[PDB]
Amino acid sequence: LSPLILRSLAELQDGLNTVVDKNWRQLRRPGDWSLAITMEAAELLDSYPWKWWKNVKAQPDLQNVKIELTDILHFSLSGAMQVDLADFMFFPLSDTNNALASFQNIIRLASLQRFQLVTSAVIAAADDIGFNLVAYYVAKHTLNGIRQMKGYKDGTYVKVQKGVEDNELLHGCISPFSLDDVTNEGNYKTKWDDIMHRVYDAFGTPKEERLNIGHWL
Amino acid sequence: SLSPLILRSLAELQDGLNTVVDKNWRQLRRPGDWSLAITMEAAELLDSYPWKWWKNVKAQPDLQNVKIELTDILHFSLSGAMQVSADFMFFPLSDTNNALASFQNIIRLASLQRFQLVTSAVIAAADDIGFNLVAYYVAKHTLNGIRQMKGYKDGTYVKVQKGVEDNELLHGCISPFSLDDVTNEGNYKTKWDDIMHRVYDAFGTPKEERLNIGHWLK
Numbered sequence A: 001l002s003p004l005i006l007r008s009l010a011e012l013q014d015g016l017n018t019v020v021d022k023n024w025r026q027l028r029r030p031g032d033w034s035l036a037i038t039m040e041a042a043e044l045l046d047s048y049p050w051k052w053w054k055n056v057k058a059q060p061d062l063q064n065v066k067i068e069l070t071d072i073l074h075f076s077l078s079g080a081m082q083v084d085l086a087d088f089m090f091f092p093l094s095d096t097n098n099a100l101a102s103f104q105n106i107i108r109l110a111s112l113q114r115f116q117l118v119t120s121a122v123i124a125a126a127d128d129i130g131f132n133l134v135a136y137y138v139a140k141h142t143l144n145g146i147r148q149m150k151g152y153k154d155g156t157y158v159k160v161q162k163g164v165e166d167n168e169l170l171h172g173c174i175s176p177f178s179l180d181d182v183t184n185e186g187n188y189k190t191k192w193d194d195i196m197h198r199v200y201d202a203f204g205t206p207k208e209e210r211l212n213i214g215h216w217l
Numbered sequence B: 001s002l003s004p005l006i007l008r009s010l011a012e013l014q015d016g017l018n019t020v021v022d023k024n025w026r027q028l029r030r031p032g033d034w035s036l037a038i039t040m041e042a043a044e045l046l047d048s049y050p051w052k053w054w055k056n057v058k059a060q061p062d063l064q065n066v067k068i069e070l071t072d073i074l075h076f077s078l079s080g081a082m083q084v085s086a087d088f089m090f091f092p093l094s095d096t097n098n099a100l101a102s103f104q105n106i107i108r109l110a111s112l113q114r115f116q117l118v119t120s121a122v123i124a125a126a127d128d129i130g131f132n133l134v135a136y137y138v139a140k141h142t143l144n145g146i147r148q149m150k151g152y153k154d155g156t157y158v159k160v161q162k163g164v165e166d167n168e169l170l171h172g173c174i175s176p177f178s179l180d181d182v183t184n185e186g187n188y189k190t191k192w193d194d195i196m197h198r199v200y201d202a203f204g205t206p207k208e209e210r211l212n213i214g215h216w217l218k
Ligand SMILES: O=c1ccn([C@H]2C[C@H](O)[C@@H](COP(=O)(O)NP(=O)(O)O)O2)c(=O)[nH]1
Pocket: A016, A017, A020, A070, A071, A074, A075, A078, A140, A144, A159, A167, B054, B055
């Protein structure tokens, strides 16, 4: 990913973290981000049929893998703001052995606070798998804000409260967007705005509580 | 500090259970499999604390669940140590920040394949927290057997019943047993057998499908 796009992602990330807490930088510490990456990596690992004692014919939940890698990126962008890849990542990740090893290595890197390296690993993973990480990031960033608006912090929102996990709606919201659309330096901000409005529409956010791309960048 | 006789019998139960899962599990499994399993249980354990600063921030620790997850880690650290054949823990674990640091260190230890040291950590945690780890082990061991015979591998097992997960039924099963009851070197087997039968009663296992302590030890 280009330096411009990475910067814009990090700026979105700062903004989201601020919605969660003003003064997040004084409230948080690098070990919080390591723990967060660890827990998402566990969710990612749990998308594979790694259990030899349970549901042994299960297939990998490749749709969920996309969400979990996107969540890791939120937290590694965060950790980096408060602070070789071939030694850790093994391709192709469609091979379950490669995934389990590569994604357990994300936990070791998170524990060492190697956040920029985690970010590169996520980007490398999305490129190998062949999904649009940028588009997923913007979609899930928008959902993270909607969660905070609906009282996630206070316990008045839970992610499966309309009977379907909120994350699952994100695939449809990003379906029209190519890699080039969301990374083209002269037009990306409009595509990021389109993604935001598709997610707001998916969750019926009132027009008045919506934020445009210009609010974040 | 558990006695060598109790430690060995826990390990024999565990080998027993691993063999129900697969004959020749030692040839099928690798040390890294046990490392992964422990990592995943420790994530369950960390998630029993209110660590998330963005979600339901006034929540309290699920300290009953903590007991189950430590017990799960023990199954896997006993297994790891068999497969391979301080500065890590911060007490008290009643403090969230202590638990979060300690249990992330368990993940690192699991990754380093220091399985006997994970086992010691779990034993020390249970002493610190003050619950009967040996009784919980025998109880979950029984439920683990029940799962295997009620379709866990094939995907037909039903884990949650009207809101309540199988694991939650174990607490009532272990209530009547002290530490001395389940560790007395002359008598413990009979008490382990009583725990097994309470778990079977809780899950309504038909008598013909029950085992006794003697099907596992001797
Ligand atoms: O300070 C924070 C806290 C949370 N998140 C976001 C990142 C991630 O996308 C989401 C994870 O939320 P969750 O409550 O663990 N639920 P799920 O993993 O299903 O999205 O939280 C942030 O971006 N910054």
